[PDB]
Design a protein around this ligand. Sequence first.
Ligand SMILES: [Ca+2]
Lengths: 636, 636
Amino acid sequence: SLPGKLADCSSKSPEECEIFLVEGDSAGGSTKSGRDSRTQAILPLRGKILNLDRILNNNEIRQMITAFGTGLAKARYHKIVIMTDADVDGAHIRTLLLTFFYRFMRPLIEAGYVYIAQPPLYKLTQKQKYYVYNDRELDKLKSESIARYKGLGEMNADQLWETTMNPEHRALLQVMSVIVARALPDVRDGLKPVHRRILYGLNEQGMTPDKSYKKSARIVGDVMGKYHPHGDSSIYEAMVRMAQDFSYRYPLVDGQGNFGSMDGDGAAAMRYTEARMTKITLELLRDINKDTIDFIDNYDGNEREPSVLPARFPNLLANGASGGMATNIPPHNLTELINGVLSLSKNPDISIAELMEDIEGPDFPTAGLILGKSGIRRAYETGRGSIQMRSRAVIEERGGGRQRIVVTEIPFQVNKARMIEKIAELVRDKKIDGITDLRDETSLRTGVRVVIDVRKDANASVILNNLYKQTPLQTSFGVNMIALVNGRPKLINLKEALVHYLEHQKTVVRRRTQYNLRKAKDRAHILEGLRIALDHIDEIISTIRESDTDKVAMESLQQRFKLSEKQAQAILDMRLRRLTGLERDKIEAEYNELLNYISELETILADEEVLLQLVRDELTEIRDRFGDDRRTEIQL
Amino acid sequence: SLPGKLADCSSKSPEECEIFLVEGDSAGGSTKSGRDSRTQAILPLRGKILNLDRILNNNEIRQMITAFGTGLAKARYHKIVIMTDADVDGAHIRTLLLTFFYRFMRPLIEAGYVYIAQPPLYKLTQKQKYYVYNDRELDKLKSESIARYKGLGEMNADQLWETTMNPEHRALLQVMSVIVARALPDVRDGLKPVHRRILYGLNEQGMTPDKSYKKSARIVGDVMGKYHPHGDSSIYEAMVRMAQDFSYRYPLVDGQGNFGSMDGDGAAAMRYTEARMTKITLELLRDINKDTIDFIDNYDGNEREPSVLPARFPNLLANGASGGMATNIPPHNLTELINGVLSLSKNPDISIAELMEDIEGPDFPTAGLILGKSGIRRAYETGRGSIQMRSRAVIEERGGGRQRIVVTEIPFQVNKARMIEKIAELVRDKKIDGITDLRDETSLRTGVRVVIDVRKDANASVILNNLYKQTPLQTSFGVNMIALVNGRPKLINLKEALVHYLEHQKTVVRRRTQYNLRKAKDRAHILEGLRIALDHIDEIISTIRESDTDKVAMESLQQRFKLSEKQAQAILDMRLRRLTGLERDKIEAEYNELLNYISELETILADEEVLLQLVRDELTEIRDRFGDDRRTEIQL
Ligand SMILES: [Ca+2]
């Protein structure tokens, strides 16, 4: 009987009593409310405390035991219900607890004293809503919107009680797609859920590069409330990351203010730093509203969001993807990439070895050196391979025979401070002799500059080679090209990544042509009715002003001038100001051009290669405006 | 020369060198970037570590010393600049550091080695923008929008460098309104910045009680991005608080899901819990868009927000205000309050003693007992007084002479768990004898129920009185009626609080009448032009279709039919569908009523008492629909 932590029941006979183990925040309070305190006692576990990571019993678990009473047939509660959420987090505790019981308290499992809660699963809102517990029941329910309960904290006390812990109605049980899709980038646009939502929220609020910087909170707050309902931290961090010259080969966010550093310096408060779209990002959301990608419902059903972006440049390979680290893809050269894609499109059957005549290999924003084509080959042929990144370092001779190491560029994602802080240790731990001083003079003007002062007697060259060994001054990049292909996580090699990409581009362009074509017809149709309308205006006003209701108006108009439902409507929504003299010709001018446009669009659609070239050209154009010089040197 | 923490410079002569102490997150990275690493070294202090709270030197401060070199004329840097933000937080570190230097390192101050940074203060955007450093310079600037820099993290590296740390241009210095207004409630609506923004964001997104619950994240995310650019935690917590039956006498938020408990149980994730407006909250935002309160610019200038709400019930006193705790106001009875206000309005000169014939005193959502009219009197007469809250407890006799204490209601804001957890200690510490068992069977059906089992030999009554002493089972409420009056924090007594309130109501109602009156005229004017327009339609179409541009159209119309600029405009924006038969009469019908309405509104405005009664009645109506029975008993 823990006083402050556990809620006790009146009954004292273990046969009657039942104890619910719920996650404190998940449903501690509401679970304490809906219960039948005459026979129901609750013990909320402090989720954070519980965290294969075995160790001495937790204060939380120790309490769990005390309350049971066995830790022996002297048990206090015959039934021990485990209430936990459906979510990733929830299954954690459910398993940890179960797993636990087996190891130090199996008799309970043997005795059938531990149960597992079964809350509703679905609520069908069609105010009438439904309480389904499994797909089959749901399938039968719907045949005879949906919203799946994935958190106990979504439910009120009484409902929690009525559906899940009230014996009369309850249905106890004796005794990872979120994790997946939520991390891995789509192979089509390179973005992972948070990033895509972010770039989308930038687009939706029209924070284009041509307009002024908006405060960061203004974007975090929007995305969090509409697409990504989690801590601001996760969104702001991910947004900061896209804005760092040393993190993205092609920053997608344009930040203003303090945005951290290679040393893991933090970024300023979100209400201080400003951010807007990068010009290259516009090529990432280009045509998004021309039915080029399928939209989906947002987490709660009140908004709509892109399953992918048009991604008019090969972003996955370009900017890379980063890691648990289920995947690990490196940045590449946009010019090389686009050139590689153009080479793919000229002939489908091109070899990875030939793709590599365009795509030299990785190309980190941080520059530096790659130590050989070996790991690159393996990584491109299979999707896995270690790649050797070594800093750009030179030694320079000065005064009284003294020497000096100057580190100009460091390996990607290496924390410069921790590296400096490390060499220092190797010197205090006397594992390095010759270093008389080390400074990190890295600034905006000098660029990265770590300076190691070697002494006269020492050998800088030798020391240097010893850093490649004892420090991050050389780091391996473990390629591991995993990405969402066809909704499923897949491992890809170089060619395959581009293939799915180019495919996406052919889909985007065609889908755009179609949208544009059916939007033009729609408008051409509407213009015909307007022309008719305007021409015989006298008539139109006659038949309308004779009509008693807007509905019969619709009727006469279609009847007498042979207008369509849409057309009649448009004429009724015409403003008197459209009656001026110039209008008629603008309507005819817009029409005559629109007809020509419709024609050109049907021409693209009709011919396969015409469309592919359209893709070829648009790609070529972007490469021309955004492509730049390679920074990382592959040597040997 | 701390390696990993401090950024070093090349120069080694203390005369040249200068060290900047900046707040790590504030501007650690951007400060490391803009610097002149040839003579400028930076030491970012880990803000969190630094937190009158004196103690053993911090690891942070210890580093500060090491780097200086004196801690002696053996100093390393002749100049020691302290860069910190303007914000509340910023002045903390600025003072802590200064204060520090005096105590263990005064020679430096004596030597003039410590300076203080002076970043720009204002940026005037009129793309041309300005860099002002003080109001006078600004005043001269504007005479010859504004946005005040209040965070170093708002600035880029190069600007930080150019304006603040570049010696050529820099202007060093040898050697709380936010805190205020940001906590205290406005005496007019009872709300404090976060709450008002929240209720406003509920209104702006139309999350009215008649529509469905929206996920909590959907409100947190909106408010945070538009009005309150801080951690989601602060907003969600404050929103949860407004939704708790045991926290607000009149919940302003209508929550669904897990929302915590008296035991300090947490609320569920914001993406799990649902929330919407409470019906009483509608009386809080009633007429907000009828020019009843002054709007202001939001933190970044892209949005507009209420400096106050209409607050059609006395919310400050009703729901209270809570605490550092600069203020502390208790909940009250809405019926009593409204009655007290009506009593005020019947005669301005009413005494606090008479107000108290309506307003019995505080009235906590948690019920319980108040121990006397004493502290109440003092609190109402002066705005300060201790009030004694005691639980509702009874003893009941059972079996073999055994007794029992049953606690039904506890004092306001007392953490029930911590209280139970406390009594338990008093029993293990053998400071209480007779308690054979204690249980907290509080549920939704049983309500609050703490049960203390006393034994036969013990005296429950005696024990009980010993709890009032040794535990929160009795708690004092320290009244302290401070609130924003006229932009300034002021202490108020009972009468004064209502006075400022009733005043606000007279302002709201009049301001509404005026808005309604000038909006009706506007529309009456527009209707006259439409009538004319429609009547002579043949003409109208003639003169319009003869016009070549919409501008000359405007001209002819005003000229020939003597229409006004607005009127001519409206006729041009008329849709052909408005030409149907029924329209003309609706326009005449709407007009004929509108004229009558305009008349009635001028009647209110004209007469003082007519308006006051309007307030009297509207108040009376709300009291009738929302007023309820008093829960807290004032006894003796
Ligand atoms: Ca947080």
